[PDB]
Design a protein around this nucleic acid. Sequence first.
RNA 1: ACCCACUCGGCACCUUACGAGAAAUCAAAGUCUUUGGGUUCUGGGGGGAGUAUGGUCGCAAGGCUGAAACUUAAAGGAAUUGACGGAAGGGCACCACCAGGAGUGGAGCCUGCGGCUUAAUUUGACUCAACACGGGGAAACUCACCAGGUCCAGACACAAUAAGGAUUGACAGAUUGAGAGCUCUUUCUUGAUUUUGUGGGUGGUGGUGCAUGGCCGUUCUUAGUUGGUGGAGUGAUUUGUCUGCUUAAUUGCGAUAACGAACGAGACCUUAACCUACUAAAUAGUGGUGCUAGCAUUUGCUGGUUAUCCACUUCUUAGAGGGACUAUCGGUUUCAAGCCGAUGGAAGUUUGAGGCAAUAACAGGUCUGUGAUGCCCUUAGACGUUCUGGGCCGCACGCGCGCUACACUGACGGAGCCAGCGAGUCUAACCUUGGCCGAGAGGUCUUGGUAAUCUUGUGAAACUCCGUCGUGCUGGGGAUAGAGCAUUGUAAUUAUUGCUCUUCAACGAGGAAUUCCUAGUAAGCGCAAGUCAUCAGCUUGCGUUGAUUACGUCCCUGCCCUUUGUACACACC
Lengths: 64, 71
Amino acid sequence: QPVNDFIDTATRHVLMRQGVLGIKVKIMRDPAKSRTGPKALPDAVTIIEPKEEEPILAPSVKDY
Amino acid sequence: KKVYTTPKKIKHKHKKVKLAVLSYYKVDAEGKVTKLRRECSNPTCGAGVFLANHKDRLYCGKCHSVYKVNA
RNA sequence: ACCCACUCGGCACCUUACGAGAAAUCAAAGUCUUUGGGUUCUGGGGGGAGUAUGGUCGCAAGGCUGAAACUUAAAGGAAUUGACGGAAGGGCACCACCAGGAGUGGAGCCUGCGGCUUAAUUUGACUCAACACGGGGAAACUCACCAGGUCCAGACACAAUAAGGAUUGACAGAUUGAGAGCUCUUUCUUGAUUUUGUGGGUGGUGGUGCAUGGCCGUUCUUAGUUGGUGGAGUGAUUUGUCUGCUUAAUUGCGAUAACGAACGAGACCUUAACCUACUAAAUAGUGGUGCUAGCAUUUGCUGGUUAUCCACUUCUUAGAGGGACUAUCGGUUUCAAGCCGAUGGAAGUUUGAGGCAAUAACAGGUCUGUGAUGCCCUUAGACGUUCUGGGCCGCACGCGCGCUACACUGACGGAGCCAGCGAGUCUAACCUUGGCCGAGAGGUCUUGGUAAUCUUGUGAAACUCCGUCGUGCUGGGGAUAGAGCAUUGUAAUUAUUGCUCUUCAACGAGGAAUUCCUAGUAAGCGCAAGUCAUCAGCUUGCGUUGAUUACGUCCCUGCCCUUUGUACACACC
Ligand SMILES: [Mg+2]
Ligand SMILES: [Mg+2]
Ligand SMILES: [Mg+2]
Ligand SMILES: [Mg+2]
Ligand SMILES: [Mg+2]
Ligand SMILES: [Mg+2]
Ligand SMILES: [Mg+2]
Ligand SMILES: [Mg+2]
Ligand SMILES: [Mg+2]
Ligand SMILES: [Mg+2]
Ligand SMILES: [Mg+2]
Ligand SMILES: [Mg+2]
Ligand SMILES: [Mg+2]
Ligand SMILES: [Mg+2]
Ligand SMILES: [Mg+2]
Ligand SMILES: [Mg+2]
Ligand SMILES: [Mg+2]
Ligand SMILES: [Mg+2]
Ligand SMILES: [Mg+2]
Ligand SMILES: [Mg+2]
Ligand SMILES: [Mg+2]
Ligand SMILES: [Mg+2]
Ligand SMILES: [Mg+2]
Ligand SMILES: [Mg+2]
Ligand SMILES: [Mg+2]
Ligand SMILES: [Mg+2]
Ligand SMILES: [Mg+2]
Ligand SMILES: [Zn+2]
């Protein structure tokens, strides 16, 4: 499917003196910018990256 | 393929003859003019066009054929 | 005799390589542009050619010595990637087999291909990957074929003719298949729109698919493709991408000079499954209520009622979510990837089925889908086009996809009576309910429907029930044929289709062969759509009834992947 969402195809027969050649062009647009669609490949599995912890600090509690 | 045959006799076309036509018209000695060939009584051809003369036949050609006035 | 250490001198092998090489490799092929221990011998692009000539040896065959003219841009070496092999090793699959199913092969006809036949019987395609294929079910059309008849719809430029008419049309007759003025007789008409000539265009289902685009089939029911940084190699290149194990998968685990990635596979998308959870609906349905019928009466039971109202969303529809991740546990396994089993589960075979699908290859098919196209052919007695009729169906026969059967798990007659995917009429005649008439096919009057609204609950067929038939080519079977009635269409003869009566063949389960298939599958069974004015024994889908047998293998066949040989690279055509 991502085909459908992302790559643009076209054929165009250019008709020269000798014979005729076909032109086939294929453009793959950045899934990042996709605007109104899926924003990425169904392959795309990002991990969000944790955070250094400075733990311990024996119990205690604050009041308000 | 095959090319050519024929029992001869190839067809022609048409000629439209020649003539110097509209002498058909007679004006007496200065200069009263009398029309030969009676004209046409169909309002599509206001009496300018003429009837040809065959047998029975008096025929408006301007009418590409139409109508048979016989006198 | 044997063991252990040593040492000369032998035949070798091993690993390394400071080193050497164009490499393969080499303790010499090392100590060579940092070029000299001594010495012998041979070579100087290939072919001509170890030829000719001489000499010399020999019994001989022949040996040693040994040229040139001419010809020619490569011959050649080692290694690399490929492609191929009638080598070797591993795998993968019901277009392979195993265990079986249903058959095809035999018959009748249907249908395509050949062949013959023909005025023509238009043509493409010929192993899988030509032959119910070109959506190819051709009565006209289509249509290209044949027998003939018209028309230019021959742009444009020049020239020529020519307003004393360049050209156009035609009534009747003749003529013609024809109410074509095609042509001719006759003689009006038209008015510079044509005509004629040359150049130049134009059309063509004419050629070329071995000139092309595009598409498509095949390889492929396959698992392959590449780059970053690192290791090797002067180098093209390799390693990564691999013994093994696992998987449908270069799917993974694992081993590991590799590490870590991308295309492709997967993911993804579509459809069939599950939601008493969510938003709802007189174009979907349920319960209650009235209005109401029938039967029973003691409350009951069975229907009627596009709105007489109330409510609801289980069933139907489709939005949004959820759900499965092979989960739990257990066996098995390098206790790795996995695999197998049990419970749970709508679902646990890639969940079932599809859609998409990398790099490359083929002289695969398609110029006959295209106003996609090169070049060739042809272009007015046309290979343009249209009109009339015939033809593609022609029948001693070979082949292929099918259809209907040989019956008693059946035919026939009643009777029960149940699906799902579809499709339907505007500037129109599509889907058809209902009422009559008709044995039937059909007709005729009306009617709803541009459709979740009407056809339609598509009351489909197999199938289930009670009968008749009773193994007899029988009431199985319905080929072939006659006579009549009807529908489509301008047209039905060579019989479009449908009905009625009659006629009642072959075929008693099919030789060698050979196809398809693993679950709601196979097989049986009908329906809708495509085609379509009329015609399905075809196809695309659909649903109904619903098995036996695998859950393995490499034996046959087919194809991958290594290894390997290569003098092939236009690559074994
Ligand atoms: Mg070296
Ligand atoms: Mg070599
Ligand atoms: Mg078998
Ligand atoms: Mg058999
Ligand atoms: Mg015709
Ligand atoms: Mg010309
Ligand atoms: Mg010319
Ligand atoms: Mg054409
Ligand atoms: Mg080709
Ligand atoms: Mg092609
Ligand atoms: Mg050809
Ligand atoms: Mg299979
Ligand atoms: Mg290097
Ligand atoms: Mg490899
Ligand atoms: Mg519901
Ligand atoms: Mg269970
Ligand atoms: Mg060819
Ligand atoms: Mg084409
Ligand atoms: Mg045919
Ligand atoms: Mg076929
Ligand atoms: Mg019956
Ligand atoms: Mg009657
Ligand atoms: Mg009988
Ligand atoms: Mg019968
Ligand atoms: Mg039909
Ligand atoms: Mg067909
Ligand atoms: Mg090689
Ligand atoms: Zn007149």
